[PDB]
């Protein structure tokens, strides 16, 4: 499942 940081989804 992607993680959101500061509006953007990324791997983690």
């Amino acid at each position: 499942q992607l993680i959101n940081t500061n509006g953007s989804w990324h791997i983690n």
Partner: antibody
Amino acid sequence: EVQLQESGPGLVKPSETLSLTCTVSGDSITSGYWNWIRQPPGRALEWMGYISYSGSTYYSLSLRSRITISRDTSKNQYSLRLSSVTAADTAMYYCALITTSTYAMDYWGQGTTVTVSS
Amino acid sequence: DIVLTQSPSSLSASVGDRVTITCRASESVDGYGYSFLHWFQQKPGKAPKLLIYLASNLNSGVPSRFSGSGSGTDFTLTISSLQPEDFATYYCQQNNVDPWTFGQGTKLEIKR
């Protein structure tokens, strides 16, 4: 099934602080992303911010100096604080959940109206 | 800031007519093989309901007459053959580019 419900005063005075709470049932707020969205009468939806499952937050830049989103996992609630309100903050306020099943705002509260007026 | 522009802003159609609504993003809303562009339906006085997620996925419980298409900066919501209950305002929403935003809405009116 998850259910979200907004609560708080329906009238706030200019210059004062708007507070709302979203009480969540049927799901723990230790999963997902917990958002506040608003809609001025007859206008488009506006995203304001979230608090995530971890307590991380993400706020709309234009609101940053005025907004806080907080939570209490014992009460399974999260809350919006918006300082120094003006007539521009009159709106229907919604809480909404994003789950990773869709990466979309897939579950919404019913909304609560707040009018900024003396 | 990123802007989502919907077209048209309003439309009138008869029951059974095809409906096509477009949403153009000022920059790509894609990431990791997904398009983070979602479509909502809002009926008078009610919260928006998710119709389509990640550009092309029909949300559970939504009628199959609804579909979404598109990639990058250009997206389309289609209602194949309108039902009377499709009267609503429709919004696109992007949640991968800071700041998150909605389109300005498209009002669907039903002719009869």
